[PDB]
Design a protein around this ligand. Structure first.
Ligand code: FSC
Ligand code: FSC
Ligand code: CL
Ligand code: CL
Ligand code: MG
Ligand code: MG
Lengths: 223, 223
């Protein structure tokens, strides 16, 4: 791999530089290189991995949605071709992330924080695949199964206010609403999650109110 | 070239789609392909070419400035290496643009609008090269010579309110201030340009007040 000759610590350092420079493709490539060193990731390093790929795929998703909307309105080959080009690139990034998860990260992750984090990522990237799929049913099932395993662990091992637990619940509720055609399940999940977190605030000394607000924002739109 | 098999009209269409999707690297590659068909560009097509590359290089410039600022504050090899990586990529894009200008576009451009447009672009991309150069003097001279030839044509052939003329003057004034160490020349140019445009408004039936405002913004900062 192109990063094989660079020290792990140097890859991490350069990922952090790339983050400051808003060079997310570079950031992702540095973090992929780091993963491929074969050592587990720390909490901070997992965050760098996630943010990098979330920004790469986010730009591809936004572009895909622009092109798909133009395509749907049109209904020559150019709009479909270019939509397909963006779609293939998006799929490739999702496949790269899922490959890192499968080959390197999920099987070695024993602590609840890391395991839930990676299983959430797996659900997220299957979700992104599902947004463009038409096939679709198997991808949807793969996202659901990853999210559900993460949920089971998070409920057993993490407090209701843990930010990973909260972000997982937020994303799984969006999966229910937008992907799985299950708005009632989405609403139930978001509401139970929010209420249980409210009741656990008392034990605490920013990430989690942020996410709680996002749950409330979705609930406001959905109800 | 990778676009050699695609119709010219399809490349133009896909550049416009890429613009809507904020996919500027794709937009640039489509417009490079179009240029390499060997036909002159229309006014609209020149704008697509410019916007595409301006956005690509703009992201590289912003990242370079972040990394250079970190490097300067530091004064291991990682910050310099990664700054150099971004710098080389930026230089490559500038070289690509300058190559299109030289090989295809400037020699065939006979009308004042197209000639000034392309010579302005040439000055711009030498300017971007000059921002990272340390060498530097020859690049600065190449930018100056391109801008000056464009200026001579624009003053002879275009009215003072023409947006290309205005944008050229704006950029050449920034070259004087930021690159060439000539703030008095920058101020003189911006002020003469603004005043002469004010006096020609009367002949007119958005692009040019925008640029006039940018001239005034710079003058406010400089004086
Ligand atoms: C190194 C800096 C970067 C990568 C920008 O850090 C991103 C952020 O990284 C941490 O925050 C995580 C985190 C985010 C927070 C919700 C951001 O919070 C604020 C207040 O900005 C959003 C990010 O995408 C990130 C890394 C991702 C997840 C998500 C990962 O799923 C696989 C699950 C929820 C959330 C968790 C892991 C957050 O803890 C930190 O706790 C945040 O800082 C604090 C304490 O507020 C920091 O902004
Ligand atoms: C196809 C749409 C895109 C590519 C977004 O169009 C970009 C823009 O293209 C035209 O505007 C040009 C133009 C710009 C205008 C100043 C933008 O005006 C407004 C009101 O947004 C900025 C662009 O970068 C562009 C193409 C570039 C130049 C610059 C090129 O140097 C080599 C010299 C000055 C300026 C000229 C060419 C402008 O005429 C149009 O006249 C603008 O629309 C009008 C009439 O207001 C449109 O937003
Ligand atoms: Cl295409
Ligand atoms: Cl590097
Ligand atoms: Mg625990
Ligand atoms: Mg004329």
């Amino acid at each position: 791999g192109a990063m094989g000759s660079m020290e792990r610590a140097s890859l991490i350092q350069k990922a952090k530089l790339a983050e400051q420079a808003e060079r997310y493709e570079d950031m992702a490539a540095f973090m992929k290189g780091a993963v491929e060193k074969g050592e587990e990731l720390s909490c901070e390093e997992r965050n760098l991995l996630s943010v990098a790929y979330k920004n790469v795929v986010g730009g591809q998703r936004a572009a895909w949605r622009v092109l798909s909307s133009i395509e749907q309105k049109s209904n020559g080959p150019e709009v479909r071709e270019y939509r397909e080009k963006v779609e293939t690139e998006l799929q490739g990034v999702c496949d790269t992330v899922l490959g890192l998860l499968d080959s390197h990260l999920i099987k070695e992750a024993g602590d609840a924080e890391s395991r839930v984090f990676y299983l959430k990522m797996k659900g997220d990237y299957y979700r992104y695949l599902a947004e463009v799929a038409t096939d679709k049913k198997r991808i949807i099932d793969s996202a659901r199964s990853a999210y559900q395993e993460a949920m089971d662990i998070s409920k057993k091992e993490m407090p209701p206010t843990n930010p990973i637990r909260l972000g997982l619940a937020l994303n799984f509720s969006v999966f229910h609403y937008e992907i799985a055609n299950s708005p009632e399940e989405a609403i139930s999940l978001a509401k139970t999650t929010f209420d249980e977190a409210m009741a656990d605030l008392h034990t605490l000394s920013k990430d989690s109110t942020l996410i709680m607000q996002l749950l409330r924002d979705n609930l406001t739109l959905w109800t």
